[PDB]
Amino acid sequence: TSVQVTVNANPPIATITSNSPICFGDTLTLSSSTNCGQSQWIGPNGNSTGTLGTPGGNNVLWTIGSTTNIPSTDSNYLSGDWYMICIDTITGCRSESNTITIDINPIPSTPAAFNNGPICIGGTAQLSTTTVSGATYAWYADATLTTLVATNQNPTISNITTDSTFYIVVTVNGCSSLAGSTTVSTY
Amino acid sequence: TITSNSPICFGDTLTLSSSTNCGQSQWIGPNGNSTGTLGTPGGNNVLWTIGSTTNIPSTDSNYLSGDWYMICIDTITGCRSESNTITIDINPIPSTPAAFNNGPICIGGTAQLSTTTVSGATYAWYADATLTTLVATNQNPTISNITTDSTFYIVVTVNGCSSLAGSTTVSTY
């Protein structure tokens, strides 16, 4: 007598892509092209069963289908090296994936901004702010930032005849902070 | 052996080409090698073609920067073979720059035009809207003898890719 043994094959290695250039607060998408059943995601929090528990529901790291979505309020919304495991729900076979580096960029703070002292009607004012490495600067006249006045670090605005305010946006590595502000008084 | 037109400005077409003379050509890009993409062997599947070359237009979902590799498929025997890895760079088009003027200027005076400093950029300021007449390549040039209202157009080219021209207006008191 002799016994035969069926051996189940593993699913293929998954190719993972992601929207890796993320400004903090937005949603992180992790996606395989493959068509595997049970999808297990491993992030910077590790592969501990204290996190990877329930296989479905609202567990962002365990889903049905080959893609997931980590919102900015989730405790797995973390920069670092991510890897996916495909689980065959019929045979129990499992397979790995390529490592993905994901960068969630901080939002810079609202910058301080400064004025000159009070200025005579029709005069000019230099506006100024903090130097920030990697930053692009924009100074706006409108509170809703639709009207731009300058992109200089510390621009001079001419012909100020009445009390006027300016709004400042500092964008670092693609992420824009909430605008700060200045006020030019008129003597 | 795969070659490609790897220095691409976004919007143009990406050519991936083998010298070899194999039959069924399978391309693997940054989207992976998943059968959810690599499906139909012909038709309009840009990653599966007949012949040893393909063309990925700028509207395709495989128009991606990254490491590409080709597989040659023998349509008679089923035998398959690999290829050298190709790094392909599709450069973004910079945005249209903001540009600024001085206040209104007296007839025959001069005006300094200015814009944003962009790393890796080459600057060109033009007098004509169609950009055929160039005035300066300075970051913030001064244009003399302005006697009437006149506009300028600005092109910022980064790593070889030119954005759509921005503009300024010099008013005359």
Judge whether B155 and B126 are in contact, CB under 8 Å. yes
Q: Which residues 6+ apart lie within 8 Å of A152 measured at CB?
A: A137, A139
Name B48's bridge partners.
B26
Q: Give A-chain residues touching B115 at CB under 8 angstroms.
A: 151
- In this structure, are strands B86-91 and B7-9 parallel, antiparallel, or unpaired? parallel
H or E stretch including B14?
strand B14-18
State the best of A19, A20, A34 to mutate against chain B, taking most chain B CBs within 10 Å.
Answer: A34
Cα–Cα distances in angstroms (integers) from residue B131 to residues B10, B135, B145, B164, B166, in the given order: 21, 10, 20, 10, 11
In angstroms, the CA B98 to CA A67 distance is 39
Tell me which residue of B27, B6, B124 sits closest to B73, measured CA to CA: B27
Read off the amino acid at residue B39. Answer: G
Structure tokens at A129: 């702010």
Report the gap between the CA of B108 and the closest CA in chain A (Å).
Answer: 21
Q: Which residues 6+ apart lie within 8 Å of A41 measured at CB?
A: A30, A60, A61, A62, A68, A76, A82, A83, A84, A85
Q: What is the resolution of this structure in A?
A: 3.7
Structure tokens at B10: 């976004």
Cα–Cα distances in angstroms (integers) from residue A40 to residues A11, A97, B123, in the given order: 13, 11, 49
Tell me which residue of A53, A25, A21 sits closest to A40, measured CA to CA: A53
Number of H helices, E strands in chain A: 0, 18
How much is the CA Rg of chain A, to the nearest whole Å?
Answer: 26
How many residue contacts between A and B have a Cβ separation below 8 Å? 34
Q: Give A-chain residues touching B116 at CB under 8 angstroms.
A: 136, 151
- In this structure, are strands A16-18 and A28-32 parallel, antiparallel, or unpaired? antiparallel
- Do B35 and A34 make contact, defined as CB atoms within 8 angstroms? yes
CA B95 to chain centre: 12
Helix%, strand%, coil% for chain B, nearest 5: 0, 50, 50
Cα–Cα distances in angstroms (integers) from residue A137 to residues A143, B12, B116, in the given order: 16, 31, 9
Judge whether A100 and A82 are in contact, CB under 8 Å. yes
In angstroms, the CA A140 to CA A180 distance is 10
Name A82's bridge partners.
A100
Name A38's bridge partners.
A64, A87
Judge whether A64 and A12 are in contact, CB under 8 Å. no
Q: How was this structure determined?
A: cryo-EM
- In this structure, are strands A156-160 and A164-172 parallel, antiparallel, or unpaired? unpaired
φ, ψ dihedrals at B162, nearest 5°: -100, 130
Judge whether A82 and A41 are in contact, CB under 8 Å. yes
Please name the member of B34, B103, B116 whose beta carbon is closest to the beta carbon of A33: B34
Please name the member of A150, A151, A159 whose beta carbon is closest to the beta carbon of B103: A159
Residue that has been written with the tokens 């495989």 in this structure: B62
Query: At A186, is the secondary structure helix, strand, or coil?
Result: strand
φ, ψ dihedrals at B155, nearest 5°: -115, 130
Report the gap between the CA of A111 and the closest CA in chain B (Å).
Answer: 20
Tell me which residue of B8, B155, B32, B24 sits closest to B91, measured CA to CA: B8
Cα–Cα distances in angstroms (integers) from residue A99 to residues A13, A27, A170, B88, in the given order: 11, 19, 33, 20
What would the DSSP string read from start to end of A142-162? STTS-SEEE-SSS-EEEEE-S
State the best of A13, A15, A30 to mutate against chain B, taking most chain B CBs within 10 Å.
Answer: A15
Tell me which residue of B27, B22, B52 sits closest to B37, measured CA to CA: B27
Structure tokens at A108: 């810079």
Residues 36-75 of B with CB under 8 A from A: 36-37
Helix%, strand%, coil% for chain A, nearest 5: 0, 45, 55
Report the gap between the CA of A128 and the closest CA in chain B (Å).
Answer: 16
Please name the member of B31, B37, B98 whose beta carbon is closest to the beta carbon of A148: B98
Report the gap between the CA of B114 and the closest CA in chain A (Å).
Answer: 10
Let me know if B32 is exposed, middle or buried by CB neighbors in 10 A (0-12, 13-18, 19+).
buried
In angstroms, the CA A149 to CA B98 distance is 9
- In this structure, are strands B166-170 and B150-158 parallel, antiparallel, or unpaired? antiparallel
Q: Which residues 6+ apart lie within 8 Å of A19 measured at CB?
A: A28, A29
Judge whether A116 and A166 are in contact, CB under 8 Å. no
Residue that has been written with the tokens 């990925």 in this structure: B56
Judge whether A38 and A89 are in contact, CB under 8 Å. yes
Cα–Cα distances in angstroms (integers) from residue B81 to residues B19, B69, B72, B74, in the given order: 14, 11, 5, 9
Tell me which residue of A106, A21, A16 sits closest to A68, measured CA to CA: A16
Tell me which residue of B164, B15, B11, B173 sits closest to B97, measured CA to CA: B164
Residue that has been written with the tokens 């790291």 in this structure: A61
